[PDB]
Amino acid sequence: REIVHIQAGQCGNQIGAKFWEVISDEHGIDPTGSYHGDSDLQLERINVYYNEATGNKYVPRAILVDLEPGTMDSVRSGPFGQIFRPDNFVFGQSGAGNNWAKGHYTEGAELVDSVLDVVRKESESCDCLQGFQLTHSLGGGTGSGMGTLLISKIREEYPDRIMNTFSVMPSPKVSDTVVEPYNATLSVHQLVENTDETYCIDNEALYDICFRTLKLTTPTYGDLNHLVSATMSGVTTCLRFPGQLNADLRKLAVNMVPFPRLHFFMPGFAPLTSRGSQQYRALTVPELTQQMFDSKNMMAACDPRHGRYLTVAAIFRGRMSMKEVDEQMLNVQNKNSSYFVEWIPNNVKTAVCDIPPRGLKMSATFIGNSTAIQELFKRISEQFTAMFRRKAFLHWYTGEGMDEMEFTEAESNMNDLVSEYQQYQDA
Amino acid sequence: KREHEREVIQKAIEENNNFIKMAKEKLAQKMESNKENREAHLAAMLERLQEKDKHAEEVRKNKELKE
Numbered sequence: 449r450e451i452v453h454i455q456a457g458q459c460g461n462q463i464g465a466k467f468w469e470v471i472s473d474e475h476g477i478d479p480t481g482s483y484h485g486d487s488d489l490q491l492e493r494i495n496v497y498y499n500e501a502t503g504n505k506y507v508p509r510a511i512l513v514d515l516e517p518g519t520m521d522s523v524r525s526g527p528f529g530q531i532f533r534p535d536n537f538v539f540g541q542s543g544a545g546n547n548w549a550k551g552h553y554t555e556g557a558e559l560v561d562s563v564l565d566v567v568r569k570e571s572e573s574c575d576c577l578q579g580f581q582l583t584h585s586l587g588g589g590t591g592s593g594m595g596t597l598l599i600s601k602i603r604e605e606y607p608d609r610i611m612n613t614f615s616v617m618p619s620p621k622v623s624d625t626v627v628e629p630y631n632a633t634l635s636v637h638q639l640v641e642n643t644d645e646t647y648c649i650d651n652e653a654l655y656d657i658c659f660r661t662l663k664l665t666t667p668t669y670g671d672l673n674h675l676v677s678a679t680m681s682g683v684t685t686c687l688r689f690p691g692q693l694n695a696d697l698r699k700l701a702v703n704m705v706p707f708p709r710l711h712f713f714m715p716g717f718a719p720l721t722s723r724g725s726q727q728y729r730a731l732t733v734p735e736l737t738q739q740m741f742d743s744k745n746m747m748a749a750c751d752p753r754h755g756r757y758l759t760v761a762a763i764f765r766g767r768m769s770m771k772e773v774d775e776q777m778l779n780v781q782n783k784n785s786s787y788f789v790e791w792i793p794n795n796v797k798t799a800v801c802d803i804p805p806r807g808l809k810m811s812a813t814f815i816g817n818s819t820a821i822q823e824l825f826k827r828i829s830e831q832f833t834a835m836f837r838r839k840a841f842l843h844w845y846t847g848e849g850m851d852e853m854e855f856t857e858a859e860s861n862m863n864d865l866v867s868e869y870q871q872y873q874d875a
Numbered sequence: 876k877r878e879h880e881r882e883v884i885q886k887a888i889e890e891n892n893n894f895i896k897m898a899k900e901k902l903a904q905k906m907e908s909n910k911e912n913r914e915a916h917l918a919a920m921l922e923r924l925q926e927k928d929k930h931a932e933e934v935r936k937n938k939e940l941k942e
C-alpha cells in the first residue's frame with residue numbers, strides 16, 4: 449500500500465524535508481539512499497513511503513512543489529537534499545506573494561499540470577496506491593492556494609483514493625502577512641470538502657509550547673519545525689511499521705471520522721523537547737499518558753476540556769509494559785469519561801511500536817478528533833471578519849479575478865463547520 | 876469548479892486588458908484635446924497680430940489719401 453507524498457510552498461517544503469530527514473533515520477536510510485540499519489522491522493513496510501532503486505537504493509515517493517525556486521534550492525542543498533528524485537522537483541519562477549488567488553487561479557493554474565504529470569508517473573509504479581499526503585501552510589499563497597488546487601485535481605483523477613494533509617494554521621504570534629486569515633479561510637473551505645484526514649498544526653500552539661514550556665525566549669521556524677517533525681513521525685508510525693491498528697490511511701479514516709466533514713484532528717506529543725537539549729530521564733508510562741493528553745502538549749491551540757473527544761488514536765513508542773499502557777489508557781477514559789462522547793463506544797484506540805524515535809527511549813503521539821477544534825476555526829473566522837467587514841486588503845484578490853462573493857461563501861462554510869462541531873458537543 | 880476556475884482567470888485577463896485599453900484611449904484623447912487647444916491659442920494670437928498689419932496698411936493708406 450504505497451503513499452504518494454507532496455509538499456507545497458515554503459512551509460510545506462521546509463517541514464516536508466524535515467519529515468523525510470527524520471523518518472529516513474528511523475528506517476536506516478542515509479542521504480545517499482542506502483540502508484544501514486540493524487533491525488528488519490525498519491524495512492518491512494518501507495515500501496509505503498520509499499521506492500526501491502538500483503543497487504538496493506531507496507528513494508522517497510515525494511513530489512516537491514513551489515511557485516518560486518528559493519526554498520526548494522535550499523532543500524536540494526540541505527542534509528538529505530540528494531535523496532529526492534530530481535525529476536520530482538516541479539517549480540515556477542513567479543511566486544505567489546502570499547496570495548491564495550495567485551496559487552489557486554492564475555500563477556498556480558499555469559504550473560499544476562506539470563505537477564500532476566509527476567503524481568501520475570509515481571502512481572503507476574505503485575502496486576496498490578492507498579492515497580496521498582500533502583504538507584503545506586494555509587496562510588501563504590502556494591501551499592494554501594495551489595495546494596488546494598492540487599487536492600481538487602487529484603481527487604478528480606483519483607476519486608477512490610484517500611487524501612491526507614498536514615496543514616499548518618496561521619497565527620498572529622507567528623505571522624508573515626495580514627492576509628493569512630483570508631488565505632486560511634479560503635483553504636479550509638477546500639479542505640472540508642476534498643480531504644479525508646487533516647492534521648491541524650497550529651503555529652499558535654507551536655509558538656506557545658516553545659515559549660511557555662520549552663522556555664525558548666524567541667523561537668524560530670526551525671524550532672517550530674522540531675515539534676512538527678516529531679509529530680509527523682509519530683502520526684505515521686502505524687503506517688511505516690508493522691501493526692494491526694490504523695495500518696493504512698483508509699482504516700485510520702474509518703476509525704477517526706464519524707462524519708465526513710468532521711475530519712480535522714488535534715495532534716499531541718510527549719515528552720515535549722527542544723532542539724539539542726538532551727533528555728536523560730525516561731518518562732514513566734503514567735507520565736507519557738498524562739502529558740500526551742494535556743493541552744500544553746496539543747499541537748492545536750484548543751482547550752480539549754472545552755469540547756468532547758469523538759475519536760482518539762494513541763501510539764506509544766519504545767520498550768515498555770504494554771499492560772501498563774492499557775491500564776493507563778483505560779484510567780484516563782475512566783477518570784475523565786465526560787470528555788469522551790458516550791454514543792461512540794470504545795472510541796479510544798491504542799497502538800504500540802518497539803522502535804522509539806531518535807534521542808528518546810520512549811514517546812507517545814496523540815491524535816484526537818475533538819469538537820474543541822472549533823476554537824481554531826472560530827479564531828480564524830474572527831480575524832477574517834475584522835478585515836472583511838471593511839473589505840480590507842481585498843484588492844490583492846480581486847486583481848486576480850476573484851469576486852467578493854467567494855469570500856462570503858468561504859466564511860459561511862467555515863462557520864457551518866463550527867456549528868456542526870458544536871452540535872455534537874451537546875449531544 | 877473547473878469551469879469556475881476558467882472564468883476567474885478570464886476575468887483577470889479581461890479587466891487587465893480593459894485597464895490597458897482605457898488608459899491608452901484616455902491618453903490619446905488628452906493629447907489630441909491639448910493639441911487642438913494649444914494650436915487654437917497660437918492661431919488666435921497670430922490673427923490678432925495679422926490685423927495689426929492690416930491696420931498699419933490702413934494707416935499708411937490714410938496718409939497717402941492725406942495729400
Ligand SMILES: Nc1nc2c(ncn2[C@@H]2O[C@H](COP(=O)(O)OP(=O)(O)O)[C@@H](O)[C@H]2O)c(=O)[nH]1
Nearest residue numbers: 457458459462585587588589590591618622669
Ligand atoms: N511551521 C512553519 N510555518 C511556516 C514556515 N514558513 C512559513 N510558515 C507559515 O506559513 C504561512 C506563510 O506561508 P508560506 O509557506 O511562506 O507561503 P507559500 O510559500 O506561498 O506557500 C505563515 O502563516 C507562516 O507562519 C515554516 O518553515 N514552518
Ligand SMILES: [Mg+2]
Nearest residue numbers: 458459588624
Ligand atoms: Mg513565506
